[PDB]
RNA sequence: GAAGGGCCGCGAGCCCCCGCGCCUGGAGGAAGGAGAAGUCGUAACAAGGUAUCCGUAGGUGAACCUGCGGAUGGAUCCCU
RNA sequence: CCCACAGCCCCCGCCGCGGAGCCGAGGGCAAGCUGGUGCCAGCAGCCGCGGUAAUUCCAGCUCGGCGAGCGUCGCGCGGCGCUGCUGCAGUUGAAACGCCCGUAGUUGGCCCCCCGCCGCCACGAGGAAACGGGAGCGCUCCAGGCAGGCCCGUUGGAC
RNA sequence: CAUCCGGUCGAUCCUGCCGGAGCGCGACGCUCUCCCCAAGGACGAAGCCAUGCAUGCCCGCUCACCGGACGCGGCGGACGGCUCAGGACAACGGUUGCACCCCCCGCGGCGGUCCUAGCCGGACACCGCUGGCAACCCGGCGCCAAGACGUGCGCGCAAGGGCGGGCGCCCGGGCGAGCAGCGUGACGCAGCGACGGCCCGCCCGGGCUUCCGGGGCAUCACCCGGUCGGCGCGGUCGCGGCGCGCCGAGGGCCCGACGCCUGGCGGAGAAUCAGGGUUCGACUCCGGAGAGCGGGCCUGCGAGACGGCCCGCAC
């Protein structure tokens, strides 16, 4: 099936090397799971058997994430709304998909339920006076069936503002 | 010299050996192929073939005889060869349409003797080797 | 390539030290992992059979082991494929022959008869240092032990002596220069020397120079080189004291044998 | 496969390149008439160890006297030519090798040592009595008339105490 | 980049000589060594051309000399990062260098 | 949670076209070699009866002949 | 006796099958006498024989070589300094480009007393045996095998 | 263990080839007393296959017949054996590495599990009754076991994720090398547990990877366009143009690229014999590849397995 041996490539000069074997079960690939934000439904992960018994979980769909505002260390579960930004292709900001290196959009309500009332970075409180604060993903889902990240702070978070403020 | 003698000249050495053997005629008819692929026995060492015609030749200027010999096809090539059965006498013994085992001459694939573009000889007939029949030591009444 | 794991072992593919006989047959004994790997080890049965010579066949072997008739470190095994490497305990209580394994000067295996007072141990080779699970320091050796919770003061390369009823450590010996040791792969396995210098290369292996009691030097690097003691062994050692005749002196020694 | 392909083998005489040469066969005649040899493979196999022994006596020759392994190959080899009786024992040099000759080799056979102890008439005799198994050497019957003997046993060479 | 990145130097380190340097930040490196045969006793020179990360904190151009640490596989054909450069002079003749 | 269906992925087999390599028929045309004691002349070897040969160009049943320039491996080591 | 069962080898008793072919005899290349045939039949790796003595064909006698093996066919090495690194040839035998410039390539005078680097030499570590070499051992010898002796280097299988 | 001989002429000396003389590998032909060792459908048919055999064992579970059957369950069947089609910067040989990896048995340790425990629940197999079909194959009903399956008694514990070192450099858990482990803020309750094994180390094995070596033809001189590099994600046991999107333009070549051919498996080695070398290497050991051609997959630590399954084609 899907493969990732080299034999099928051509050599550093451009020629065909040639073959002398058949596929092989250790240079296997699989098709994506192509994880789906949910915006019969509901949380679907599914388990996979791996070279060794060892076991792999990728999930489908999901809705929530556990998410960290480092600079005040500030933790918790929140749900996401929706994928606003995406370097390698903006198709997958259209359908919604997550992958690591997501921009995402997150609820205020767990964060705002305790903030607005010390003195912290201007920018985030302007966020948590509103309805949702801009994040990032920093987990593989796919691999470990789930999806974290961390709330964005300073030079990162002015270079996506710029980037998404046109639009 | 002549020839280059550098410390640092071995490259040029094989290339030029490389290059100048084959200029032999009996390196070149040993690894160029040609005489492989025109040799109708394909490097064995006899054949086996179908006698269609029973011929004799005549011999060279300062010789005067007819040597005996019979037409063969081999089985394998389907081609047509000469071959040629020396022993006195050997000639009533072999008959048309037969089968036959047919190997070489001294020298590799040239002429011997005063026999006139002739490389081949006959060795078995039916089974039973003809330098045995010469002797008596067996007959062929099976045939 | 193999799907799987090997099973077999061809007689002309085994160690040479073991000295199998060409004419023997066409398989030898695979040994089975355990303390020792292959190429560091000599299994049960040959000893038990083509040297004591108390059996002729596997099968008298195999009644014997499952017998219970041959003690490892104080405990029975009963594999006739079991691997014995350097300084284990070999007992035989039904006829009380005790012997320790360990290297003569040609660079083969030997049994050396020993005394009770000596029989309660023996001498291990660490060589790692980790941390286990919850960060618990650990320790690990040459015969495929782990230890936990060892003195921090002791490091790699060193020598622990462990009782053999109770894996914990008496005494350890450290690597240093001027302390007896004993080479145990290469060339020179069988030779014993004090050490005399040590001369490190980053990113490649270390060499070690160790000078005989008769005044001659060798070279081996520091993955085969064993302490025994300091200045002076800790266990009993074959009659010869590591001296590795030259050929001339074996072949005198061969004719007046003669 | 069968343990049988691992036997090694070799063969043991070398024939000559120059096959038709007159006092070649006239000295082979001549030879196998005085030690009344069968065929002339045995004079092929006693060049053939000739050979072998001269060749080890040149590479040790090439090399120093202090060499450790000239001294060790020297020894061995004096030793055993020694003990064969073919070299004389007042020899101890790896010179006097080079001088030695087959019929040196031929007159250590056992038709040879009991012909010259006057227990046989003649060396067709001897080949004849040892076929019929009237011999023995250090009490075993010896039947191989190329069978050499080493000096140590010729003075226990004897008839057969079954013989008859 | 082996000071600031995520990789490190672990096996063999080598010299060579700059051969071209037109990507982004690789370069391509030459080796030159000596091959000995023996029917004719005598040698034969040979190259080979090796290919290298090159980080931004070094400056290069063709024909200087560069030390080259190996690393884990970074792409299709660049198993090796620069570790050290020394220039060489201008115009300089061309000339084979075994290192 | 079965049968069944849709989209993608791995990918057989057949059809169409292109290219490469190895063999092979063919009226007629043309080369070479061997065989014999064929017909027409004598080009070369002697100054071989016009000294021989090289390159180039034209002509003629055939060997060959002629023109321009060159060589002696020539038939000359020798003349104000 | 051996053998899983049986052969075989070996040992003990009674009777006792003693059998040599294949090539060649002009030279290379060791080895010659009558009868036929008559450039026919045939031999002959090459030179050559045979057109009335055929020292060469076909037969008999005799003789030589190897020998339980001998001869024929094909291939590889050698022969071959006829592929030439060691170690060919290049006026006339086969073979110096019509001449000059010139990049890759190959090759480059003499000089510094010691430092660094490359080649080079020596030693060493590390890494399978089998094969080959080789120490010791009377499978009756031998091709072989690693045995084996009693009062054995710790018996040995070194390198 | 450094050798020559016959043949161009009316005679002679040379060049130069033809032929002879030796060893080995096979086939053909004649012949053959005794003993010992010993190869044996490889040689442009990896062509086709009747017939028989080549992988079983057993601790657990007996109201079976008189405990042996049978069946469930466990281990093994991925080793061994055959061949050399394919494949020419590959395989393979020597030398590195994983601070980019996985691993059954075995040996030694370790063993704390968030929110009826004098012992839990329901089934199937064999078997009984009733039956289909030429064969191969199975159907329905029915009581019963487990070291089988499911649930699960218990001192907080799997994967992953955020934060936590310096001020030119160098001078313990561990390294040549900031690598491991731990704390702490949030997520999630994976594995073990109705006769206690999840986890760690070693070992054998595998996967990839550095450097050097690795056939011939120039009547093949220019070749490559995921081809060369960079950024990001995905997938993988894992690094990686391995795959996808975007960006740039590169990479190789007379020190012979690319293409074509091979009656091309490689090495340890074999034949030959002054020294230097030439030719071969199907076959005993190691390594690779395949099981009519081409593809796909389940079980399992481990197979893209064929004395395992699915499809197309040829039989
Ligand atoms: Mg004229
Ligand atoms: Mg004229
Ligand atoms: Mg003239
Ligand atoms: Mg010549
Ligand atoms: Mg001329
Ligand atoms: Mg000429
Ligand atoms: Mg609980
Ligand atoms: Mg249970
Ligand atoms: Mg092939
Ligand atoms: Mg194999
Ligand atoms: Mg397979
Ligand atoms: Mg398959
Ligand atoms: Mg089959
Ligand atoms: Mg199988």
């Known amino acids: 099936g899907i493969t990732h041996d080299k034999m099928y490539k051509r050599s550093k000069t451009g020629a065909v090397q040639g073959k002398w074997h058949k596929k092989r079960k250790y240079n296997l690939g699989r098709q994506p799971a192509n994880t789906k934000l949910i915006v019969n439904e509901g949380q679907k992960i599914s388990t996979i058997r791996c070279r060794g018994g060892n076991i792999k979980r990728r999930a489908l769909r999901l809705s929530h994430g556990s998410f960290a505002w480092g600079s005040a260390d500030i933790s918790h579960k929140a749900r996401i709304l929706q994928v606003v930004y995406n370097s390698t292709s903006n198709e997958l900001v259209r359908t919604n998909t997550l992958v690591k290196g997501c921009v995402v959009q997150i609820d205020s309500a767990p964060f705002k339920s305790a903030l607005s009332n010390d003195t912290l970075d201007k920018e985030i409180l302007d966020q948590i006076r509103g309805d949702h604060i801009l994040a990032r993903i920093s987990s593989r889902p796919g691999q470990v069936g789930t999806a974290d990240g961390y709330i964005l702070e300073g030079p990162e978070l002015l270079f996506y503002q710029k980037k998404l403020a046109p639009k | 010299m002549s020839k280059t003698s550098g410390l640092y000249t071995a490259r040029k050495l094989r290339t030029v050996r490389r290059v100048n053997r084959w200029a032999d005629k009996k390196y070149r008819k040993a690894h160029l192929g040609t005489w492989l692929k025109a040799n109708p026995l394909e490097g064995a060492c006899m054949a086996r073939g179908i006698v269609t015609q029973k011929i004799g030749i005549s011999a060279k200027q300062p010789n005067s005889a007819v040597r005996k010999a019979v037409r063969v096809q081999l089985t394998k090539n389907s081609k047509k060869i000469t071959a040629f059965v020396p022993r006195d006498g050997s000639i009533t013994y072999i008959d048309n349409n037969d089968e036959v085992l047919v190997a070489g001459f001294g020298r590799a694939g040239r002429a011997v003797g005063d026999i006139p573009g002739c490389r081949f000889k006959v060795i078995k007939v039916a089974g039973i080797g003809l330098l045995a029949l010469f002797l008596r030591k067996r007959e062929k009444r099976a045939r | 390539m193999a799907r799987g794991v090997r099973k077999h072992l061809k007689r002309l593919n085994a160690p040479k030290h073991w000295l199998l006989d060409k004419m023997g047959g066409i398989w030898a004994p695979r040994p089975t992992n355990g303390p020792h790997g292959l190429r560091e080890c000599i299994p049960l049965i040959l000893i038990l059979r083509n040297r004591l010579h108390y059996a002729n066949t596997y099968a008298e072997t195999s009644m014997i082991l499952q017998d219970k008739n041959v003690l490892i470190d104080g405990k029975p095994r009963t594999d006739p494929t079991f691997p014995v490497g350097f300084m284990d305990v070999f007992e035989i209580p039904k006829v009380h022959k005790t012997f320790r394994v360990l290297y003569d000067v040609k660079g083969r295996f030997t049994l050396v008869p020993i005394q009770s007072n000596e029989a309660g141990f023996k001498l291990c080779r660490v060589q790692k240092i980790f941390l286990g699970d919850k960060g618990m320091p650990y320790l690990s050796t040459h015969d495929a032990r782990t230890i936990r919770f060892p003195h921090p003061d002791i490091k790699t390369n060193d020598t622990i002596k462990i009782n053999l009823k109770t894996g914990k450590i008496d005494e350890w010996y450290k690597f240093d220069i001027g302390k007896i040791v004993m080479v145990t792969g290469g060339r020179n396995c069988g030779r014993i020397g004090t050490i005399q210098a040590i001369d490190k290369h980053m990113g490649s292996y270390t060499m070690i120079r160790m000078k005989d009691t008769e005044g001659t030097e060798f070279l081996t690097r520091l993955c085969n080189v064993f302490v025994i003691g300091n200045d002076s062994p800790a266990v009993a050692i074959p009659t010869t004291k590591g001296i590795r005749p030259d050929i001339i002196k074996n072949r005198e020694l061969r004719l007046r044998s003669i | ?164 | 980049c082996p000071f600031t990145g995520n990789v490190s130097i672990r096996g063999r380190i080598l010299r060579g000589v700059v051969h071209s340097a037109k990507m982004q930040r690789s370069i391509i490196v030459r080796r030159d060594y000596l091959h000995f045969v023996q029917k004719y006793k005598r040698y034969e020179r040979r190259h080979k051309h090796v290919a290298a990360h090159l980080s931004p904190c070094f400056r290069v151009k063709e024909g200087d000399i560069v030390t080259i640490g190996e690393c884990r596989p970074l792409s299709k054909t660049i198993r090796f990062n620069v570790i050290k450069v020394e220039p060489v002079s201008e115009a300089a003749k061309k000339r084979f260098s075994p290192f």
């Open chain 4, 1 to 164: 496969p069968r343990i049988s392909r691992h036997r090694n083998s070799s063969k043991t005489y070398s024939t000559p390149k120059k096959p038709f040469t007159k006092p070649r066969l006239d000295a082979e005649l001549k030879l196998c008439g005085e030690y009344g040899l069968k065929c002339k493979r045995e004079i092929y196999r006693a060049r053939y160890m000739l050979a072998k022994i001269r060749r080890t006596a040149r590479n040790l020759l090439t090399l120093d006297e202090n060499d450790i392994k000239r001294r060790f190959e020297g020894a061995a080899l004096l030793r055993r030519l020694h003990m064969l009786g073919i070299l004389d024992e007042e020899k101890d040099q790896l010179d006097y090798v080079l001088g030695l000759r087959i019929e040196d080799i031929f007159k250590r056979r056992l038709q040879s040592v009991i012909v010259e102890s006057k227990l046989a008439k003649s060396v067709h005799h001897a080949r004849n009595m040892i076929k019929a198994r009237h011999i023995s050497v250090g009490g075993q019957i010896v039947n191989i008339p190329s069978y050499m003997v080493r000096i140590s046993n010729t003075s226990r060479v004897a008839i057969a105490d079954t013989s008859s």
